[model samples]
Target: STGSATTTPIDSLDDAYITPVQIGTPAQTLNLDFDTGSSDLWVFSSETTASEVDGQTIYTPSKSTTAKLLSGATWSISYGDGSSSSGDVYTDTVSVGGLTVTGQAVESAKKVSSSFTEDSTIDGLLGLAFSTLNTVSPTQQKTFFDNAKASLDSPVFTADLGYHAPGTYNFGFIDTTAYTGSITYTAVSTKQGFWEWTSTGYAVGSGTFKSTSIDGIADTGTTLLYLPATVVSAYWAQVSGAKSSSSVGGYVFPCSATLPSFTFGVGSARIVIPGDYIDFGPISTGSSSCFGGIQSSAGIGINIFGDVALKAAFVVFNGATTPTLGFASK
Candidate 1:
């Protein structure tokens, strides 16, 4: 089976990508955050606390004839950035692109962190990570991607995230028009539950490449790109007024500062991010200081190649028997 769905970036900063997901009997559509990091298909729902349901679209099982409660199933999930959600489970018809997956576990959120409530751009999150990372207890559940794998022609999906425009998630097939150059394939490390892989090395602007191996996860759920302190500080050091401040939060610099491009290697392929992308929006209102997109991953414990890096290239998440990740220039 092959299908494709349009995913739109939420805000000007290109924070998160949201895809339309058709769920249940009558086809209730919700704009879900298409995340590749976490493995919980959760949504704000009728079960959610009323006070917590600020401006979000919610799923109601009672309205869907096909919705069935998973008896004793429950789920509680937290992210590296500290966002958390927990809720009961229901099985229902979930559709993405044009493909349908029946009896997919739909976690209806009963509680959500304030950060989630504050963000109204998404109604839920559709995880693309492996089923092993699913948080459902009593019985672990499969992700929509995992369930759709058998039906897929090649058991693969591609993420073509855009900078300030709507991108797409193509299932079962790759769109050659979306990228240039031959795709570089790399082995995925199962040591972590994420779509984790290693980069051969990185280079700052036109600097020499360092062959140091960098292990990280390609997380669509996150916004900024994070790397080791040495690499992060190295990039920021080049900026004239860049500094890491506790009160300011992360590396911030003059908005007018000239920034340099950042490049990372995957096998023989190199993905280069433009300098402007690293200049994240201004820090405070009426201030010339802006936050840097590439920050130290030391606090998070693992490097994260988030949207800031992902949009620079075309990425393929292979769900083959032996999982692999492919990267190509866009």
Candidate 2:
């Protein structure tokens, strides 16, 4: 929460989908998907039946007027990238971007798949990212910062994905002038979405990661940061001898390999991951050229740093003043 100002870009509404704030009191629309990768805030109810709520984001709460339906609830959603959806569970009085929260616990899938029927156009994914794995936890599971953390004023929730450049996903609160001061938190170790580091057991450049140890998760909806194949082949061997090239099926690197930067101490906070992401996109996977860092995954949580180690870093999700996790460098 420092000094910064830049918010003026709202001219891209083709089918009308923008709800940072404006839902409830006869305005009960649901199209959430603010995902930080995991933590849950589900939405798409009305007992979900637009053909099993195909592609999700269907919070009509009967068009609000103040929707509510948390009776005998049952909602399920699992996606680390794997994909899953179930049905039942509602409690409206939820709003995003404009920020308003009450009851807040939604999820009403009926039967979805085909990647939510192929993401029709995205309008249901607000994870706000950080996990307790929230489903509606009283001890059960629930998180959009645990039902908006009493309507968030600043218990701490930050994830400004506006522009570090690359796809642009954008999320709620956490603008604090893009951080440099008041950001560097960490302390949530019971383990669910994984983030409790001790790291000293995984290396690849000079080779020697033979599962030295594991547990480092910072997934921003996970783009790629999986380690352990002896530190993913010693991090592509710094590219000089780049191997492991699979092409869309998993391992990648038929090309692009100048690889070098790689660090993740976490407990002392290192987190580097540069190297143009080792090779991200365009490597003949479609003939664009890009593919490096991390490969070989099957277990050990498969070392995920994803979102390419969170691009320039400005991720803070301080679970209501504690349960911490803060980092700033933008």
Candidate 3:
């Protein structure tokens, strides 16, 4: 089986991309962030404290005839940005585009941090990460994609994320028209429950490529590209007024600076991230300075190839036995 869903940017080019999903019997629609970094399908639900929900939509499981509680099972998750959500679990019919999965695990949030509660636009998160990362207690949960993979022609999903424009996520099939050139495939090591891979080297603008190996994860949930501190410093050094700002908590540069493109090697393929993409808008609204999209992954342990890096290419998350990642220019 195959399914396709349109993805829209949350606000600007650098924010998360959300897609519409149908849950339970008659289909309760919810716009969710399709995150590849974590593995849990969770939603703000009626179980959540009303005062803490802000303006976000809440999923009421009681409204769906097909929804069933999973006994005492529960889930709690915290993100790198300190955003957290905890909830009970339910089994229900979940659909994305044309494909539908029966008895899928759907986490219903009972509590959520301000970071999630404040984002009223998104109703929840639909994780595309490996099922091993599912946070459900008693028994681990399977992601919507995982439960639906057996019915797919091929266990794969391609992410065609665009800047400001609507993109598409194709499941179980690849649309050749969505990309340019041949897809460069790389083996993924899922020891960490992420689509982790290695980069052979990188270069700043038109500079010579440095053969520095970088171990990182391709995370759609994160907004910026994060590299090792050493690599981050080298790239920012080329910009005249670039510096780490305490107020912004990352490297900021003059908005008028002529930024250079960043390139990273995926085996033989050279994926070049455009200069303008690295200049992630302004530091703040009405501010003259802008934040650098590439930052240090000092504390995070692994570098994150977030939206800034992923949006430049059409990405394929293949969940077969080998579990490979394919990339091509969009």
Q: Compare the candidates by TM-score and give the number of the best one.
A: 1
> TM-score for every candidate vs. truth?
0.98, 0.33, 0.98
Per-residue lDDT tens digits for candidate 1, residues 87-119, read 999999999999899999999999999989999
Q: Write the per-residue lDDT of candidate 3 for residues 1-330, one digit (tens) a residue.
A: 999999999887547888999998789898999999999999989999887788877789999999999999999999999999998999999999988999999999999999887888889999999999999998998998889898999999989888768889889999988888999999899999999999888999999999878989989999999999998999999999999987789899999898899998888888888888887778678888988899999978889999989988999999998899998986
* Candidate 1, lDDT over the whole model: 0.92
**Segments of candidate 3 deviating more than 4 angstroms:** none
User: Count of backbone clashes for each model?
Assistant: 0, 41, 0
Could you tell me the C-alpha RMSD of candidate 1 in Å? 0.9
Q: Quick one: ranking by lDDT, best first?
A: 1, 3, 2
Provide C-alpha RMSD values for all models, in order: 0.9, 16.4, 1.1
Candidate 1 residue-wise lDDT at 74: 99
Per-candidate local distance difference test: 0.92, 0.53, 0.90
Q: Give the lowest summed-lDDT range of ten residues in model 1.
A: 277-286
93: Cα error in model 2, Å: 1.8
Flag the better candidate by TM-score, 1 or 3: 1
